[PDB]
Design a protein around this ligand. Structure first.
Ligand code: DTM
Length: 186
């Protein structure tokens, strides 16, 4: 059950990656907000499902894969079998979601979180239903090679507040950033 959510951290120039790593220096409190938002379920016997494309999965340090206490599904048309550590591999968002109903998965999933990359995010962002986008706006330009698609405002509404989401500008290592929530339903 649950809902369909996208989570992303983006630079002013809409960059989410550079050469297998983040465009910016490590931001520990941002990391920690991603972990908590994706892991938290207040339901007993369920876990959240984290969906990620091949490049996002490999951008995570092996020391952090799989993502503990979450079901990890890799989305890829080119891998031949689930990468070591991953639970499932699916060829598309559709089948991933579909997957979410057979034997293990409809009785075990709470929320669904899409953690990257651009093509997964485009796929989803343009998928029927009630989707939420949790966006961290890093207020600085960073040289990037991977990007999040423009958010078609007035299609997507910004929510003034949402539980567990800080409303204030944050700062780390002198980079300012803020958390934003957007939603849609079609
Ligand atoms: C989970 O651990 C790590 C994950 C990454 C890179 N990824 C995939 C990442 C980081 N931040 C994010 N923040 C928000 N808001 N949304 C995301 N979708 C997101 C995804 C890099 C690391 O170190 C280089 C890690 O080590 C802790």
């Amino acid at each position: 059950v649950g809902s369909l959510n996208c989570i992303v951290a983006v630079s002013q120039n809409m960059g989410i990656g550079k050469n297998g790593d983040l465009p910016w220096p490590p931001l520990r409190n941002e990391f920690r907000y991603f972990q908590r938002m994706t892991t938290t379920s207040s339901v007993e016997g369920k876990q959240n499902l984290v969906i990620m494309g091949k490049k996002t999965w490999f951008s995570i340090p092996e020391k952090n894969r799989p993502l503990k206490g979450r079901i990890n599904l890799v989305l890829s048309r080119e891998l031949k079998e689930p990468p070591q550590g991953a639970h499932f591999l699916s060829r598309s968002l559709d089948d991933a979601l579909k997957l979410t109903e057979q034997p293990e998965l409809a009785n075990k999933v709470d929320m669904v979180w899409i953690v990257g990359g651009s093509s997964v995010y485009k796929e989803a962002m343009n998928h029927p239903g009630h989707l939420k986008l949790f966006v961290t706006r890093i207020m600085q330009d960073f040289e990037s090679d991977t990007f999040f698609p423009e958010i078609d405002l007035e299609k997507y509404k910004l929510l003034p507040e949402y539980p567990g989401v800080l409303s204030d500008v944050q700062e780390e290592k002198g980079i300012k950033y803020k958390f934003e929530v957007y939603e849609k339903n079609d």
